[model samples]
Target: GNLAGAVEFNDVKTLLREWITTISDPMEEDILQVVKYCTDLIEEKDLEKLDLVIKYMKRLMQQSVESVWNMAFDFILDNVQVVLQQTYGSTLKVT
Candidate 1:
C-alpha cells in the first residue's frame, strides 16, 4: 500500500507516457527510452538510475519546446513527491 504523501507509481508513469505524445526532441527521445528503464528503477528502488533519469530530465528542462514545459512540470512535481516520500517518511499530505 502507498503511504501518506506517496503519489501513485502509475500516475508518474502515466505522466511520463503522456509526455511522449505531445512533442519530440533530442532529449525527448531518451525520455521514451527511459520509459522502459523507469519502471525497473522504481521497482528496483535504484535512485542511482533515478539520478540518470533526472540528468536527462534536466536536459529536457533546458531543451524541451514550450508545449512540453507544462506537462514536464506536472511530471516533475509528481516525481519530486515520489522521491520525497521515499527519502523522508510520508508525513506530508497528498492533497
Candidate 2:
C-alpha cells in the first residue's frame, strides 16, 4: 500500500556502512555481499521483511559491538517519528 518509495543507493550504502564497521576485521567481499542482499530487498520492495531481519540482526550485532550499534539505533530511533511520519511509509515499518 505504501510502495511509493524510491531507492537511493548512495544513501543506503552510507548507512549500511555502520553495520559493516561492527564486524571484526570486515572483508570487502562480505561487505559487498551484504549490500547486495539488502539492496535486493529494496528492489523487491520487501523492506518489511528486510526490516524484520535488520531488527534481529541488530540484536546479534548488539552483543558483538553493542555500544556502537546501540548508539546508532538510538540516534535513529530518537529522530524518527515512526507513527507521525509514517502515514505514508514502508510496509515493513522501520521501527
Candidate 3:
C-alpha cells in the first residue's frame, strides 16, 4: 500500500480556496506563504505531487488579483520547477 497520508488535490484545493477568500488584501508575503504551504505538503517527489503543485499554482494564479500575479509568477517559476525537476528529468518542454 502507498503512504496513505499523502496529500490529494481536493485537500489542497479546499484549503487554498478558503484561505484566498478570507484575505482582505493579498500581498507578496501572503503569496510566498501560499507557495510554501503547497510546496511543503508535497511530501515527496512523485508525479502526483508534481501535478498537485502545478495545479495548485494555477489555482492560486486564478484566485489572485493582478497586482500579485508577478509575485506568484516569480514563486511558481522557481518553486514549481524544483518540484517538476524532482518528479521528472529536465528533458521536458513547456512554454
Candidate 4:
C-alpha cells in the first residue's frame, strides 16, 4: 500500500497544471509534485508527447534545486527506463 496514494489525479492533468502554477511558498513541502507530473507524462506513453514531455522536463530541471535534483534524478527510471534508454539513448545520471 506504500504507493497507493503517492499521487492524485484530477483527470490526470491537474497535477500537471499544479507543477507550473505560481508557488504560494517555495520552501513549502511540494509533496513530490514534479515527480507526480513526470510520472504522469511518462505513463501517458503517447509518441508525440516527447516534445511536450521534454519541454516539461526542462522546466522540472530548471525549477528544482541542485541539491534535490540528484535525489529525484532516478525517478525517471522507475517505470520508464525502457522508453528512456531506447528512445533517448541515454538516461540522465546523478552528479
Candidate 5:
C-alpha cells in the first residue's frame, strides 16, 4: 500500500505487534537481522544515514507490494479451486 493510504495508526500498531509476535516466536537469525537493520536505520543521525533510511523505506514499500501480491495470489489459488469445482465442475491450477 502507498504510504499515503488511509491506514489508521492503531491498525498499523496492531500489524506491527503481530509482526513482532511472529518474529519473536521462532527466534531465528533472520529475525535478528531485521532487528539490526531497523536499529541501524533508526539510530542514524547523519545525512548519509538519513538517505540510507529513506532508501531502505522505499525498498521496504516495494517489498510490501510483493508480499501483498503473493498473499492475495495464494488466497485466490487456494479458494478459487474449490469455488470453480463447486460452481462449474471445473478445476483451476496455478503454474
Candidate 6:
C-alpha cells in the first residue's frame, strides 16, 4: 500500500546527484556504485524498496567521507521539497 504512493525514480536520481556534490572528494567508484544500485532498483520499478536502498547508500557515503553525514543531511533538508515537487507534482508532499 505504501509503495503505491512512493517517490519516482527520477526524483531519487536528482537527490543522488545533489548528494554527490556534498562529498568533499567524491570518488567515481563510490558515485557509480550508488548510481548502479539505485538504477538497478529503479529499473526494477520497485519504489517501495528505494528508502531501504537509500539508507544503505547513505551509510556507504558516511563511511566514505567524514563530513558526509552533516553535508548530506543539509542537502536533503534544503532540497527535499524541491526534489519532490519536481519529481512528483506540486500537490505531493513528503510526509
Task: Give the per-residue Cα lDDT of candidate 4 at 78.
Answer: 47
Could you give me the TM-score of model 2 versus the true structure?
0.42
Better of 4 and 6 by TM-score: 6
lDDT of 5 by residue, 1-95 (tens): 10123134334334533443343232334333333433342333233432333334334434553454334334433443454455546542222
Quantify all predictions' global Cα lDDT against the true fold.
Answer: 0.48, 0.46, 0.54, 0.42, 0.37, 0.46
lDDT tens digits, residue span 16-83, model 6: 54554465664545444444454454446554544655554455455555574445444443343344
Which is superior by lDDT, 4 or 5? 4
**What TM-score would each prediction reach against the true structure?**
0.40, 0.42, 0.53, 0.35, 0.27, 0.37
Please identify model 5 stretches exceeding 4 Å from their true place.
1-65
Using TM-score as the yardstick, the better of models 2 and 5 is 2
Query: Local error of candidate 3 at 57, Å?
Result: 2.7
Q: Highest lDDT, which number?
A: 3
Cα lDDT for residue 8, model 1?
53
Candidate 1 lDDT over 1-95, as tens digits, reads 12112235544434544454455532544433444454455566655545544554555454555656546545654655565467654413322
| Local accuracy of candidate 4 as per-residue lDDT tens digits, 39-70 | 45545654334344444544654565444443
Worst 10 residues of 2 by lDDT: 1-10
CA RMSD of each candidate after superposition = 11.0, 9.8, 5.5, 7.5, 17.0, 10.0
- Kindly report which residue stretches of model 2 are placed more than 4 angstroms away from their true locations once superposed: 1-23, 65-95
| TM-score for candidate 4 | 0.35
Residue 30 of model 6: what lDDT?
Answer: 49
Of the candidates shown, which would achieve the greatest TM-score relative to the real structure?
Answer: 3
Q: State the lDDT of candidate 3 residue by residue for 1-95, as single tens digits.
A: 01112345666566656655565456767666655554554544344555554666566666665546545656755775675467554512332
Ranking by TM-score: 3, 2, 1, 6, 4, 5
Clashing residue pairs in all predictions, respectively, total 0, 1, 0, 0, 0, 0
- Which residue pairs show collisions in model 6? none
